[PDB]
């Protein structure tokens with residue numbers, strides 16, 4: 425009975441920021457953050473996020489499986505014990521198992537960072553992992569935060585995560601086109617048929633946060649009352 | 652889950668599939684879940700429903716061969732897929748076999764416990780998997796077991812014991828192409844792990860019930876005819892203890 429909303433967008437578009445803001449409007453609303461802290465210290469452990477950026481042809485498959493697993497684990501745990509003694513419970517996911525596969529992993533495959541065997545294994549693993557464990561995780565709606573790759577590049581410097589500081593603009597441009605093809609043009613098809621009827625709210629977040637944040641929060645409230 | 656689950660464990664080419672495929676013929680309540688070795692040497696993911704009508708299921712990579720050729724690069728990848736494909740196969744047969752059995756028994760060729768505590772652990776110990784890879788693998792494997800709880804728990808284990816030299820010869824007899832370069836030293840390491848887990852029972856697992864699961868050790872070093880009778884008898888006796 426919890427409504428599951430995924431918040432999607434490029435790296436450093438502003439998703440944790442916006443969603444941590446939005447959480448405070450209702451006691452009924454909670455967030456599942458993207459487990460980037462677990463990725464940076466594998467458990468002090470290895471930094472598999474950094475391994476993937478420095479040696480993507482070596483570490484990409486390993487990173488992607490750990491990434492998707494940590495996300496499902498965290499999403500299932502928030503569903504199972506949180507809210508539910510609540511009038512209208514909403515859970516916001518920072519991204520989903522669908523961006524894991526169809527944006528990020530897919531882009532590593534198209535870049536030759538994963539070979540054909542690695543990609544076939546990843547998809548088999550993802551198909552099976554989701555058909556079992558991830559049934560309770562189907563999305564009721566998606567919020568797309570769009571910001572240009574230049575904005576996202578600026579916001580990477582501003583935030584200052586060490587593993588990310590060498591990300592080139594052209595890398596962010598590739599991830600942007602994939603989001604646009606998925607969530608704006610809707611030309612990117614998944615092997616999950618329910619996803620084609622999931623409503624999408626696109627929000628422009630290119631501006632500084634004083635500029636639009638009232639309209640944005642309100643649009644989210646409008647959007648959620650519909651579901 | 653009135654179905655009794657019995658795993659068959661032992662080294663490569665010990666004779667596990669030969670024994671159990673013959674053994675299961677004694678009852679209609681006995682079935683076997685093979686190890687998905689063919690899926691590992693020919694890697695394939697599911698086709699789209701419209702694409703498969705016009706496109707053949709192509710032969711994919713051989714991650715079994717890749718692991719044997721460069722274990723340091725491919726071990727983690729191989730072991731993750733080795734365990735996934737096994738769990739998928741084991742759970743499906745649990746859900747759909749032996750619905751009209753009186754005393755149903757499902758034999759598993761190996762288990763998720765040997766995937767981790769024998770094979771993957773030996774790869775880590777050989778430094779074919781690094782600390783980050785071993786941590787990820789174990790975390791994954793742990794989380795998956797929690798999720799089923801008692802779904803795949805074993806009522807018993809049958810250990811088929813064969814010397815490294817026997818297995819090495821049997822690898823040659825069988826003729827599986829990717830196994831032909833396996834040195835005796837590798838088989839001997841796997842041999843010591845089974846003995847610790849299954850015979851001396853000193854190997855510690857995160858799964859507490861295993862410390863007390865009934866185990867039957869059978870020597871399969873002899874030619875097949877020479878001992879099959881005594882074996883089948885030990886097995887039937889064992890099964891009635893459970």
Ligand SMILES: Nc1ncnc2c1ncn2[C@@H]1O[C@H](COP(=O)(O)OP(=O)(O)O)[C@@H](O)[C@H]1O
Nearest residue numbers: 435436437438439440441579582583631632633
């Ligand atoms: N609208 C905005 N205007 C200026 N900075 C923003 C805005 N939204 C987010 N930021 C900043 O950009 C960085 C990335 O935001 P964050 O929420 O961490 O991105 P994400 O969660 O999408 O990776 C942080 O420094 C954050 O303070």
Ligand SMILES: Nc1ncnc2c1ncn2[C@@H]1O[C@H](COP(=O)(O)OP(=O)(O)O)[C@@H](O)[C@H]1O
Nearest residue numbers: 663664665666667668669821824825873874875
């Ligand atoms: N007891 C035995 N005596 C002679 N050959 C055997 C015996 N058990 C198995 N074999 C042969 O040894 C090879 C390996 O057996 P197999 O059951 O495929 O091993 P596993 O399933 O443990 O890898 C096959 O060629 C099989 O015919």
Ligand SMILES: Nc1ccn([C@@H]2CO[C@H](CO)O2)c(=O)n1
Nearest residue numbers: 435460488491492523524528529
């Ligand atoms: N499956 C994923 C998910 C996210 N990423 C990148 C890598 O880290 C950032 C965190 O926002 O995003 C990724 O590379 N792969």
Ligand SMILES: Nc1ccn([C@@H]2CO[C@H](CO)O2)c(=O)n1
Nearest residue numbers: 663664688730733765766770771
């Ligand atoms: N998890 C596993 C399971 C089995 N093996 C080896 C590799 O494949 C042969 C098949 O018996 O055995 C392995 O290397 N790792």
